[PDB]
Amino acid sequence: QFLRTDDEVVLQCTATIHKEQQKLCLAAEGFGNRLCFLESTSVPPDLSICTFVLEQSLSVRALQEMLANTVHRTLLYGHAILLRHSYSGMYLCCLSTSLAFDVGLQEDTTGEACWWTIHPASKQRSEGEKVRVGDDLILVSVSSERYLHLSYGNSSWHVDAAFQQTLWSVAPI
């Protein structure tokens, strides 16, 4: 089992504090300020808000060539991806509003803000390799060079684009 474009997925991270551990999924709504946040899972109470389609997977080189010119494929490590929030129709985006930027939903995909390069968690996954289901991914914003990051804010968990990694688990569902 490899991750394929058009695959419907959820993104999960593990959150640990004070000897208590839980898994969270990346969530969004297409109403309000469209900012991302995280659901606790028991299986998320509300699955629809956590659902994403892997629309596109392009090499950084191909994506930059494409943007420069304007002025069911398997996922490979090092490639840039586009994540469509399935319910809203919009796209997971690195936003220009506050170290960390916010992560949220955007309509247009022209530009780099909506693109995320996938990186290996360990030293035994390699650039250009097929991404397995079960692999822990690292996601980096093409526009801002920041990671999709798990953050412990006030007494809760948040998601932003920051200078430190978070391992994400992308499973079909």
Side-chain angles (χ1 to χ4, degrees), residues 2-18 21-28 30 32-33 35-42 44-71 74-86 88-98 100-107 109-122 124-126 128-144 146-172:
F2 304 112
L3 277 174
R4 311 270 273 169
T5 49
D6 285 305
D7 269 9
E8 213 175 83
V9 299
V10 319
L11 283 81
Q12 282 191 9
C13 61
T14 304
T16 316
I17 201 157
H18 307 112
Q21 170 162 283
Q22 62 165 312
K23 287 196 304 192
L24 301 138
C25 63
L26 187 77
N33 51 35
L35 293 176
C36 285
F37 62 100
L38 295 157
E39 265 189 82
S40 295
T41 58
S42 52
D46 185 318
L47 184 64
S48 76
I49 68 180
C50 276
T51 294
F52 286 92
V53 205
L54 311 152
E55 292 269 313
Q56 308 289 344
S57 163
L58 297 170
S59 75
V60 162
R61 150 200 58 80
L63 160 72
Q64 295 188 310
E65 168 178 13
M66 282 172 198
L67 292 160
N69 287 8
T70 62
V71 190
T74 297
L75 265 65
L76 303 179
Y77 278 114
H79 273 31
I81 67 167
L82 197 58
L83 288 158
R84 209 190 88 244
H85 188 244
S86 181
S88 81
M90 312 186 218
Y91 297 85
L92 188 77
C93 187
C94 186
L95 305 169
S96 306
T97 61
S98 267
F101 293 135
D102 288 313
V103 178
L105 292 186
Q106 210 86 114
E107 286 174 357
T109 65
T110 51
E112 290 169 337
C114 34
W115 294 88
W116 306 84
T117 50
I118 77 205
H119 302 80
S122 72
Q124 280 75 48
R125 295 308 174 286
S126 208
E129 273 191 49
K130 285 172 150 78
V131 180
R132 261 88 171 164
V133 169
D135 283 3
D136 292 345
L137 298 178
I138 286 159
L139 275 63
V140 171
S141 171
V142 180
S143 59
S144 74
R146 277 157 224 246
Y147 300 95
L148 193 55
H149 179 72
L150 170 71
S151 183
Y152 193 77
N154 290 130
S155 208
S156 45
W157 301 92
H158 315 277
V159 57
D160 58 6
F163 287 111
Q164 301 177 13
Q165 288 172 359
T166 298
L167 304 184
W168 291 92
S169 148
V170 175

